[PDB]
Design a protein around this ligand. Structure first.
Ligand SMILES: CCCCCCCCCCCCCCCC(=O)O
Ligand SMILES: CCCCCCCCCCCCCCCC(=O)O
Lengths: 178, 42, 250, 269, 250, 269, 42
């Protein structure tokens, strides 16, 4: 799916099976996590070696107007293993999204770090947490409506984001004369 | 020092490395009608 | 007026179709005052850690479902730092906000009654004996009512009497709200602290019981979604604790 | 040099305000702050976005050209058409904006080395080099001893080896109001000719040669040119180029992948 | 001036023979200010529950005892609500007061040096390899020095170098006090927070090390008590925690 | 620049004042002056503690790195991880404090010498060298003619032989509020990984190479780097290291002796 | 001279070699209670 349009589609379903398992999970680290490495924020972050600030993620529900449901999205600060149940994910920074007319909800990571700055490259001393989603309630649709919908996510920086050290991007290489 | 020009030409000057001006409203908020964060979007 | 947004701690709940929230008896929860206090110690008052939304397990509303009940605050144990403080503290005070979510399309019909009964006492099916404490509270799943008389060392879960020996239709005296699929999909109830003593042990005392009873049966035609989930979310407010000792294993 | 915004204290709230809820179909980016959805303390931020400016970002030398000329036919001098689409390092940085105005500060590095031969016994004095910029439409030399080398009007620089590298400054010399990096058009009015940015690029050529006439044995030299933009202004930001470059003249590319493959949707390394 | 009384939380320590307390570098511990803060959240600040005296295990000072060391703050885990908050919190700040008790009669002689070394780094006996983390910290018993060179994947516990590659007699540069049986029987040291970053993880970072080394050997005649115990009591002060997540099992 | 305290006159005294008597178990150093216990005259002292300051003590260049690269595979360039734990002379001086903030003023000395061979007849022009500092996380060159050498964003210095040694200034580039020389912790949160100060050291690498392509016969060069700290601040003084150093990475040591052996307790040489 | 800066950056400045400030009270006298030399320590 890395060479198609399905990479941006987060599938959602209506069923009784596998309702206790995560919808998606990835690392918060913007510098090197494959999920958000190549985004607009990541591309500018790879020209720098230090970063700080807060990041906000919004989700759009691309489904039928008659569908309704709830979702739980949580950020777990680093220091523990990745949560494996919704009881573990409800003890952190979480927000409950009710799908409706607004059709979008915003989650903010409030820059929990020991130092003032972190490093773009992967280092054990400075690392971020994990993002996970869970089913607060199942998705209910009326008869005659599509069973499955899709969700899209957008990432952007806040007004307190900054970068200090300047380096070269690692995404460009020239094997020979053009 | 740092404010003395020894050359008449304007291109023969140091780079402006101490200027900080920003305007993110051009791209973040291009909508014609004002939107309030507290109030519902629609 | 349909839209409403509630923010507490690090959690936020958003609704697009709802009614005005109901404050229990018209009094917002608050902290205990010095004149009304009886204890002699410095209370610990966590704010963000122990006062946030906690989403419980969900249930499926089938056509023949008779109802469910939950017995707080014990159901809120072992979740977050709210339960952990309970184990280490002999006394505590708290207030709660209850949000119940149930959604359906425009081709579905049904009605639900959400009511909080303070100091609700349940009688046994066998009048000559008592039931174990497991029947009242399990802390993991909702207990279900029944549409007929049952026997054994269990509570009388008949929907006619609701287990309290009173009419089911007269429960509207207590603070309540209705969930009609045609109109609304979420109900929110704010409850203050109600007890005879200013503080009491949480484990051995059940302050209030949340009961959801479908007065109108769910009905739909072929082709519609048959799995309608019901989810309950509760958030403690103004948590206060007095008395520190070794943890209680229970 | 102002600092970023500070954080304001927040508390518990239950009301009809919905900062989190928004609509993304309007085309507006949400302005939610962390204080709006969580309980936060008061902190004073002194961090400044001082190195994120365009002027500081572009303010660093980068290699643009490299060639070799020898001293002992057409190998005695080098010819370069001045373009910024020959090195990938600087090409990617300058393709993030559609139009740009800037003044370059060119510098050159010249090194020489004797060639490996059977006989290497020689004693030579210091070497001197000449660099000439031919304006567009000017005559182009065809020989080392051609008549165009006497720069009556064209600029020239003479640099003896062993001294500091030469440096020069060039102003905005574009016919239009800015440098158009991307041009979506054809050269001719009949929608024919060459499609791309080559039509608008009319910069002149550069010539380098050895001032010394001859040496007993062959000697080869290499020249490297570095550009630093200053007094820069940028317009119309553009997304970064994903695919590696293929040819300098055009923007032809091959199909690539957006991101690196992961094992599963819920796979955390 | 010999008598002193210290009260913190619900615990109190009384001494009748002691010297004036030593404040580390002349600065009393306090809370972090807004200007020096870097985090963006509401810190939880327990006062009585997590700031009180905690008495560790005692040890016997024999005639041939070479010494002992403790590596806080990990040694303070799993005791009270101070350790419990550590498991659930990624970052924390605290200050400590250390009280060491050792008593003897007028017919006993000996001297002890109590010193807190910030950021003390221990080298391995085998210079070509490293030792497991169990050797540095055990969290239950004090680790003992030795009077001779040792070998293996362990720290060099020779009293001559003290495991840091520096002279043992030059440790007086750091805040310290002496316990002379003829004069005093208790030593108290107050230490502020010292670190490069404003906050750091407690589990993986060892802020300071408490070392007790007998410069003067214990000696006594027949008929005197041969069991002289040494007890150490530490009390956290101004505890602050930022960052809440699931508990860390370690 | 104030002077030290003067001496005050004293006379015979018989009273209940006991300046000499004190208690050392309190942890306080006695402040007794020579006038307190003896009869002294009045002298004016103009001596000043002007060279005992930390800034003046640290204000002197010291060697930090030394390596050789040759001009004729991987021997044509040198790679150095920037650390101050490779030379004992400066390591001992900088281990007397736990935390320190300072700005370095680096300089380099480059010398070249022809290698001894059977055939030594050659004539070569002047030589040029390039030094590039790769920021942490940046691409590292793998060849002399690799593409990383064109420093679009990274700093670089070109120094022709025969001129004055190059010099540069670097500011405080630490993530934290100071440089932690001693770190008592583990890299991972599970108390595993590497124990020592290596975890906090995240400084970038340095690359040196020859600009000239080739020479008829092999030539070798040596580069030496010197550091001078300025605008320095120090905290938490530490006792000096007694035992000689064994390995750069860690602080492992061998058992040594506190002082030199004497014949007896009452032996005066 | 000696007080003129020809470079804008602050790190591009000479070392502060004419500053003399001392505070030995931090280490010599860390006791909380004041001790008088003439008066007995205990
Ligand atoms: C060698 C001495 C004379 C040198 C004259 C200056 C070199 C001419 C270059 C002028 C164009 C510079 C900017 C062009 C960049 C672009 O084409 O976008
Ligand atoms: C060669 C030109 C570019 C040179 C760039 C400066 C060299 C980088 C060194 C930066 C770190 C200096 C201080 C680090 C000392 C330490 O690690 O404690």
């Amino acid at each position: 799916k890395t060479k198609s349009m399905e990479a941006y589609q987060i599938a959602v379903g209506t069923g009784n099976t596998d309702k206790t398992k995560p919808i998606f999970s990835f690392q918060m680290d913007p510098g090197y996590s494959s999920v958000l490495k190549r985004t607009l924020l990541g591309e500018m972050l790879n020209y720098y070696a230090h970063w700080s600030g807060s990041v906000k993620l919004t989700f759009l529900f691309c489904g039928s107007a008659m569908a309704t449901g709830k979702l739980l999205i949580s950020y777990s600060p680093p220091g523990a293993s990745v949560p494996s149940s919704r009881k573990d994910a409800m003890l952190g920074t979480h927000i409950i999204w009710d799908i409706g007319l607004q059709s979008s909800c915003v989650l903010c990571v409030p820059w929990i770090s020991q130092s003032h700055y972190r490093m773009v490259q992967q280092d054990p001393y400075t690392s971020a947490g994990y993002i996970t989603c869970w089913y607060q309630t199942n998705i209910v649709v009326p008869p005659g409506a599509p069973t499955s919908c899709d969700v899209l996510c957008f990432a952007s920086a806040c007004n307190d984001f900054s970068v200090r050290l300047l380096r070269d991007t690692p995404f460009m290489a020239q094997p020979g004369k053009l | 020092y740092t404010n003395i020009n020894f050359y008449k030409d304007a291109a023969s000057s140091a780079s402006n490395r101490q200027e900080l001006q920003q305007d993110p409203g051009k791209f973040t908020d291009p909508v014609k009608d004002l939107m309030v964060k507290t109030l519902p979007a629609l | 007026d349909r839209v409403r947004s509630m923010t507490l701690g690090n959690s936020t709940i958003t609704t697009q179709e709802s009614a005005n929230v109901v404050v229990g008896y018209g009094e917002w929860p608050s902290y205990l005052s010095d004149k009304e206090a009886t204890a002699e110690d410095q209370p610990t008052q966590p704010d963000v850690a122990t006062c946030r939304f906690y989403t419980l397990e969900s249930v499926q509303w089938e056509k023949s479902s008779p109802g469910w009940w939950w017995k707080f605050p014990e159901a809120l144990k072992n979740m977050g730092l709210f339960g952990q403080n309970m184990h280490y503290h002999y006394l505590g005070r708290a207030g709660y906000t209850i949000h119940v979510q149930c959604n359906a399309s425009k081709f579905h019909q049904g009605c639900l009654l959400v009511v909080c009964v303070p100091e609700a006492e349940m009688g046994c099916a066998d009048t000559s004996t008592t039931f174990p404490a497991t029947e009242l509270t399990t802390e993991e799943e909702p207990h279900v009512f029944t549409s007929d008389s049952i026997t054994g060392k269990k509570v009388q879960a008949a929907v006619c009497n609701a287990g309290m020996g009173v009419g089911v239709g007269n429960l509207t005296i207590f603070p309540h709200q209705w969930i009609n699929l045609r109109t609304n999909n979420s109900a929110t109830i704010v409850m203050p602290y109600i007890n005879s003593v200013p503080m009491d042990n949480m484990f051995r005392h059940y302050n209030f019981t949340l009961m959801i009873i479908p007065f109108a049966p769910l009905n739909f035609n072929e082709g519609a979604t048959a799995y309608v989930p019901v989810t309950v979310t509760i958030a403690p407010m103004y948590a206060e604790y007095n008395g520190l000792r070794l943890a209680s294993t229970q | 040099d102002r600092t970023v915004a500070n954080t304001q204290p927040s508390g518990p709230s239950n009301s009809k305000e919905i900062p989190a809820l928004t609509a993304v179909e309007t085309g507006h980016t949400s302005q939610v702050d962390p204080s709006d959805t969580l309980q936060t303390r008061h902190v004073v931020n002194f961090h400044s976005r001082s190195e994120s400016t365009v002027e500081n970002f572009m303010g660093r030398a980068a290699c643009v050209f490299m060639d070799q000329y020898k001293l002992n036919s057409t190998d005695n001098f080098a010819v370069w058409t001045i373009n910024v689409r020959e090195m990938a390092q600087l090409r990617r940085k300058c393709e993030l904006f559609t139009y740009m105005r800037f003044d370059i500060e060119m510098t050159m590095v010249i090194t020489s080395c004797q060639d490996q031969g059977t006989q290497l016994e020689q004693d030579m004095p210091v070497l001197t080099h000449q660099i000439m910029y031919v304006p567009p439409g000017g005559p182009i030399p065809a020989k080392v001893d051609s008549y165009e080398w006497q720069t009556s009007t064209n600029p020239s620089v003479f640099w003896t080896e062993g001294n500091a590298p030469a440096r020069m400054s060039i102003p905005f010399i574009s016919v239009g109001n800015a440098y158009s990096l991307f041009y979506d058009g054809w050269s001719h009015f009949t929608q024919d000719g060459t499609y791309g940015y080559t039509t608008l690029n009319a910069m002149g050529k550069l010539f380098v040669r050895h001032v010394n006439k001859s040496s007993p044995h062959q000697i080869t030299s290499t020249i490297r040119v570095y550009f630093k933009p200053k007094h820069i202004k940028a317009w119309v930001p553009r997304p970064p180029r994903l695919c590696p470059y293929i040819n300098k003249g055009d923007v032809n590319f091959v199909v690539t992948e957006v991101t690196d493959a992961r094992k599963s949707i819920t796979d955390t390394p």
